[PDB]
């Protein structure tokens, strides 16, 4: 039986801190090591090999030591291109195992919530769909109290035009609303405004149909 | 530049069998080691299997000896995974990667992005599509760079895997940033494509491709007339 274990599970740090993982070999795999960064959705990317060894292109606030059975990985500097899972693996011989994995996380700083508005888009063909959405993405605030108004050329929108919801994720909240306009509505060329009231300070966020 | 891309992944019923591909290209395929790498939904990496250059050696991750079965042809720069006697928990994406050097002791530099295997009896809801983009602001400008979000939502909570495709080729993996979140009954995931303002102003058509659990769900978009 062969194992390769990692610590810790997860780890949150402020930007600029340093970080460091660990991975564990159960038998002495010298320097054939390996460290991978993994974000979601995408295939890992090689960081470090030969256990020290930077791969072309990683910035220079990575490092990596160990031989033997005890490695570690280390961000001196943690940034929010780091925000990862990190995976080590060994290449001595097979197997060619993967350790458990390590998430790196950036400890969040209060900061206002961004807004911004998306709208529909059209059709393969260049068609406008039957009707247009504007939706409203308020993301990364602290779960509280939010109201979000739509304003047309400045002026309050029909409260029915427009949905709104909330999925809290981890201890972030985020929001968004969904205005929806006749395509004849869209036609018209207005400036939609999504404003956004929270911890009792406004943002918005304005726009129109490209011309 | 070195390019692999997997394809064969599907949905399969446990005790059945499914061959995967993965196409090689952009180096001297015949040079090197080969491996394939699995993921199973929410899990870690798994090691699968390698192969050497010239077929001579060949091992197996335990979980999978005796029932999956490595092979390449170089002639065709392949690699193929022939995958029998299925369980459930070989429901996974499915990578395959490239050695850095010529030695089967060198870290894998080069992966493709995967292609997914479900295997299951269960049925499942699919999911809803939907592309967003960027609007323009009071002056009817262009932001410095065009977003495209790809909306995936409504499904049962399992694996998806989104593909954007710019007039039918699959787009650069790092043109795009990928995050999901499950309600607990569902998971919704969005993908955001960063384009530039001439590469949105040439009508190229770009397509959100989604498989799940067998099926290939897609919307696409062009710039409006």
């Known amino acids: 039986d062969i194992q390769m274990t990692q610590s810790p599970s997860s780890l949150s740090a402020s930007v600029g801190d340093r970080v460091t993982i660990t991975c564990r070999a159960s038998?002495?795999?010298?320097?054939?090591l390996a460290w991978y960064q993994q974000k979601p959705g995408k295939a890992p990317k090689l960081l470090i090999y030969?256990?020290?060894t930077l791969q072309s292109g990683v910035p220079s606030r990575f490092s990596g030591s160990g031989s033997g059975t005890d490695f570690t990985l280390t961000i001196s500097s943690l940034q929010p291109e780091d925000v990862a899972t990190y995976y080590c693996?060994?290449?001595?011989?097979?197997?060619?195992?993967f350790g458990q994995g390590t998430k790196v996380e950036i400890k969040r700083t209060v900061a206002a919530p961004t807004v911004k508005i998306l709208q529909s888009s059209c059709d393969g063909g260049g068609h406008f769909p039957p009707t247009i959405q504007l939706l409203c993405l308020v993301s990364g605030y602290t779960p509280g109290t939010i109201q979000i108004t739509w304003l047309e050329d400045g002026q309050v929108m029909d409260v029915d035009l427009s949905t709104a919801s909330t999925t809290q994720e981890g201890e972030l909240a985020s929001t968004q609303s969904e205005l929806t306009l006749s395509q004849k509505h869209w036609l018209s060329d207005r400036t939609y405004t999504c404003q956004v009231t929270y911890q009792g300070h406004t943002f918005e966020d304005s726009g129109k149909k490209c011309a | 530049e070195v390019q692999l891309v997997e394809s064969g992944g599907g949905l399969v019923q446990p005790g059945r069998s499914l061959r995967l591909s993965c196409a090689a290209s952009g180096f001297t395929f015949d040079d090197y080691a080969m491996h394939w790498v699995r993921q199973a939904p929410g899990k870690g990496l798994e090691w699968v299997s390698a192969i050497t250059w010239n077929s001579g050696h060949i091992d197996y991750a335990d979980s999978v000896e005796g029932r999956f079965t490595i092979s390449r042809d170089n002639a065709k720069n392949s690699l193929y995974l022939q995958m029998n006697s299925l369980r459930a928990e070989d429901t996974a994406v499915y990578y395959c990667?490239?050695?850095?050097?010529?030695?089967?002791?060198?870290?894998?530099?080069?992966w493709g992005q995967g292609t997914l295997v479900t295997v299951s009896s269960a049925s499942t809801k699919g999911p809803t599509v939907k592309i967003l983009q960027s609007i323009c602001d009071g002056g009817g400008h262009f932001p410095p760079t065009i977003q495209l979000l790809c909306l995936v939502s409504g499904y049962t909570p399992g694996t998806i895997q989104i593909t954007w495709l710019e007039d039918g080729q699959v787009m650069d993996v790092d043109l795009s940033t990928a995050s999901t979140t499950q309600e607990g009954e569902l998971a919704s995931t969005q993908s955001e494509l960063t384009l530039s303002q001439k590469h949105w102003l040439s009508d190229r058509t770009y397509t959100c491709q989604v498989t799940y659990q067998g099926h290939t769900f897609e919307d696409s978009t062009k710039k409006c007339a």
């Open positions: 038998q002495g795999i010298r320097n054939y």
């Open positions: 693996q060994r290449y001595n011989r097979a197997p060619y195992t």
């Open positions: 990667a490239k050695v850095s050097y010529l030695s089967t002791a060198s870290s894998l530099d080069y």
């Open positions: 030969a256990a020290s």
